[PDB]
């Protein structure tokens, strides 16, 4: 990390507040005989797990000599949390950041990035995320100083989770993990935590979650789905499939139901993907072999970012 008790010292920069997040037992929602522990990545300073990947890319690339503040331009295609965390850290590190995303995206997504002074390049709506990806590649191809964050392939991504997320989990659960479950977006969280757990001698079963409507790891066809943050519709190079014991599909509507229930049951307020992870954890926890075992999963992002999405439409409609 190195470990740094935030509750007892004054940080020199906001990036020292990233990681070392809390862990929380699922209680009222957990009606099973297994313990379920939630790694609260929603509590990062920009409210999601991507703060760890942002920091890892800036810190490790600079240290290796591949980024130079005020010269390098960091470019990425993202209509979600990676673009936020890149924009937030690029600002305080003196990098120009360009994020591409379709024209059709909500004012909130565009506006949050411009607060942190990122340049947002909007691509034609009809081309979808493919069009935003192509624009980011062309920008980086044309300009020597422009480089791709490359969230889906960068070696920094699994590495940060192996060095931080996974050893935090290990200490918090007192070296006791029987199953680790995470939705795969880039695959960094699952891959890095699975690496750390195995290095510590844990026999935890490693479970990857994906949307039923885009079941790519399971061998099916990519498609549009609701579970923001996971399910890219290809197998990311970051993901090391050799570490996975089971791929479990979760339907977007089970994720959405579970998110709504979690707020009221346990006070956990998250996005679609924390609903999918908890649905999957509870499913595993019902398996009779898991009686008395400890299941760990992740709450990737805080709910306030999703107030305008399909996630809480049922509440919106009700209001």
């Amino acid at each position: 990390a190195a470990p740094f008790d935030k509750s007892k010292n004054v940080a020199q920069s906001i990036d020292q507040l990233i990681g070392q997040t809390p862990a929380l037992y699922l209680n009222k929602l957990n009606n099973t005989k297994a313990k379920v522990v939630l790694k609260m990545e929603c509590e990062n300073p920009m409210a999601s797990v991507k703060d760890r990947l942002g920091f890892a890319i800036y810190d490790k690339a600079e240290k290796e000599g591949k980024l130079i503040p005020g010269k390098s331009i960091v470019v990425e295609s993202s209509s979600g949390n990676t673009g936020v965390s890149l924009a937030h850290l690029g600002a305080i590190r003196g990098y120009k950041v360009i994020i591409t995303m379709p024209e059709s995206m909500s004012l909130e997504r565009r506006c949050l990035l411009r607060i942190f002074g990122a340049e947002v390049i909007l691509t034609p709506a009809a081309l979808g995320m493919k069009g935003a990806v192509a624009m980011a590649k062309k920008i980086v191809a044309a300009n020597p100083n422009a480089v791709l964050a490359d969230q889906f392939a960068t070696k920094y991504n699994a590495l940060i989770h192996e060095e931080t997320t996974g050893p935090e989990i290990w200490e918090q659960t007192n070296h006791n993990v029987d199953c680790f479950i995470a939705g795969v977006g880039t695959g960094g969280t699952l891959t890095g935590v699975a690496r750390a757990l195995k290095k510590m001698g844990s026999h935890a079963r490693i479970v990857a979650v994906e949307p039923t409507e885009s079941p790519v790891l399971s061998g099916g066809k990519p498609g549009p789905h609701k579970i923001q943050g996971i399910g890219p519709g290809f197998v990311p190079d970051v993901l090391d499939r050799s570490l996975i014991d089971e791929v479990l599909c979760v339907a977007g509507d089970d994720a959405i139901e579970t998110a709504l229930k979690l707020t009221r049951s346990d006070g956990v307020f998250c996005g679609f993907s924390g609903g999918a992870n908890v649905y999957a954890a509870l499913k595993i926890a019902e398996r009779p072999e898991m009686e008395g075992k400890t299941i760990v999963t992740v709450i990737p992002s805080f709910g306030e970012r999703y107030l305008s999405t399909t996630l809480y439409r049922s509440v919106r409609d009700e209001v």
């Binding site: 993202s78 209509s79 979600g80 949390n81 990676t82 979808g128 995320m129 969230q151 977006g185 880039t186 885009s214 990519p222 498609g223 549009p224 789905h225 923001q228 943050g229 996971i230 399910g231 890219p232 519709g233």
Partner: peptide
């Protein structure tokens, strides 16, 4: 689809 995807938003990551």
């Amino acid at each position: 689809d995807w938003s990551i």
